[PDB]
């Protein structure tokens, strides 16, 4: 459902 518009910043 959700996309990397969750994090993605590869931490």
């Amino acid at each position, epitope marked *: *459902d*959700a996309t*990397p*518009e*969750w*994090l*993605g*910043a*590869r*931490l």
Partner: antibody
Amino acid sequence: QDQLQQSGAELVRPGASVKLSCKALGYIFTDYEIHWVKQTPVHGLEWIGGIHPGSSGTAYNQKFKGKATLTADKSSTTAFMELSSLTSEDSAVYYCTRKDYWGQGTLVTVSA
Amino acid sequence: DIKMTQSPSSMYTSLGERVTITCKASQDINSFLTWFLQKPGKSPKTLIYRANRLMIGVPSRFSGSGSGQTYSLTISSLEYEDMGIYYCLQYDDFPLTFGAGTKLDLKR
């Protein structure tokens, strides 16, 4: 699908170490960060840190830099969190999260 | 270090009632926030991500809003199932931080 499954409760001795795991299912593991959160009655929720399985990138809560080590394994889509030199202060429920999904948590009791 | 101020801290409610919970970030967090509920002895369950997008499977009576430093979670009509503690999480910047939460309580 889409899910996070954590390992069972741990009963460790002070001064020892323990390594927790978080199995990811139903989604592309190397596309989302996996973060670990600590919860205790007294201190509430505390973000420990995160890891990007796709790039091995990590970020820690300064308070845990040197205490917690986060690793990830692509072949078993499992994120790991290791804690060293444990004290009763480390007794808590530990969660892994993709920020939307949360694991069911792992209870860690530090006692002699 | 972004501080999330959640309010109210305690909520005295009645079923069917409309409930609004608020979280203010000590700085702009660009809608990178989630709302989750946690029941006693149970693990967290997300209701909203990115300030106003419903998690699949979450009932529509739950909705989120806000854009800069102020975000609200609205429960259109409280149900028994909704009791527990609500929290907000900002992930616009490390370290991720949480609001102190708000206990939802059935008034009598």
